[PDB]
Design a protein around this ligand. Structure first.
Ligand SMILES: NC(=O)c1ccc[n+]([C@@H]2O[C@H](COP(=O)([O-])OP(=O)(O)OC[C@H]3O[C@@H](n4cnc5c(N)ncnc54)[C@H](OP(=O)(O)O)[C@@H]3O)[C@@H](O)[C@H]2O)c1
Ligand SMILES: CCc1nc(N)nc(N)c1OCC1(COc2ccccc2CCC(=O)O)COC1
Length: 166
């Protein structure tokens, strides 16, 4: 349970088995089961994303519905129509429950404050290339639950992990 006076911070991402989460300003696969899972977890909560992740959303879809959208930028003239832009995680993490939804820079930034991670791993063989955005690496303070491999309607295997720490 999440007491309303707390500030719970979770990270949620989908990665290939290599750790790649983004390339060329997009996610280099599509998995409908992961889209549904991402929405089930985040709906109703504040979502925090990096400026480059906001840029990756088509103008017609953003801000993402059903969730308070917060965008991190250091640029005083960057504006996100329909959403709030803030310059730090301290300013972004005011809600009782916040999901950090990417990308690679913002996961690394938020990791020291996070107590939950929800991961989808997609069994697509995408090697890491220079410039890719990557999932954060989780140290031994994190305890994980790994689901069995499942199979998507799209013909890719995937599995879910849930990590927690104190
Ligand atoms: N697979 C997934 O689950 C998933 C999820 C989300 C995104 N993605 C992908 O990941 C890629 C984007 O990731 P990315 O690592 O390139 O970028 P990102 O983390 O989404 O955004 C980086 C931007 O955040 C801002 N920022 C970073 N550190 C900050 C700090 N300390 N204070 C304030 N603002 C800060 C900066 O904005 P300014 O430059 O404006 O200062 C920086 O350029 C895309 O390919 C996207 O499609 C994948
Ligand atoms: C789903 C990808 C994803 N999966 C996990 N597990 N974690 C993430 N953080 C993540 O990326 C979430 C973003 C990309 O969402 C997309 C992308 C394509 C299609 C549909 C959506 C959801 C739209 C919505 O939610 O209405 C929203 O900005 C990045």
């Amino acid at each position: 349970l999440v007491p309303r006076g707390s500030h719970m911070v979770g990270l949620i991402w989908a990665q290939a088995t290599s750790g790649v989460i983004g390339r060329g300003g997009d996610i280099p696969w599509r998995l409908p089961e992961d889209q549904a899972h991402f929405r089930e977890i985040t709906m109703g909560h504040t979502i925090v994303m990096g400026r480059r992740t906001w840029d990756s959303l088509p103008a017609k879809v953003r801000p993402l519905p059903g969730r308070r959208n917060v965008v991190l930028s250091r640029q005083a003239d960057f504006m996100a129509s329909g959403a709030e832009v803030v310059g730090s995680l301290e300013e972004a993490l005011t809600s009782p429950e916040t999901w950090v939804i990417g990308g690679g820079q913002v996961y690394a930034l938020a990791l020291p404050y996070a107590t939950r991670c929800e991961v989808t791993e997609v069994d697509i063989g995408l090697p890491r290339e220079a410039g890719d955005a990557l999932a954060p690496v989780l140290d031994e303070t994190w305890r994980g639950e790994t689901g069995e491999w499942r199979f998507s309607r799209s013909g890719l295997r995937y599995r879910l992990y849930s990590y927690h720490r104190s």
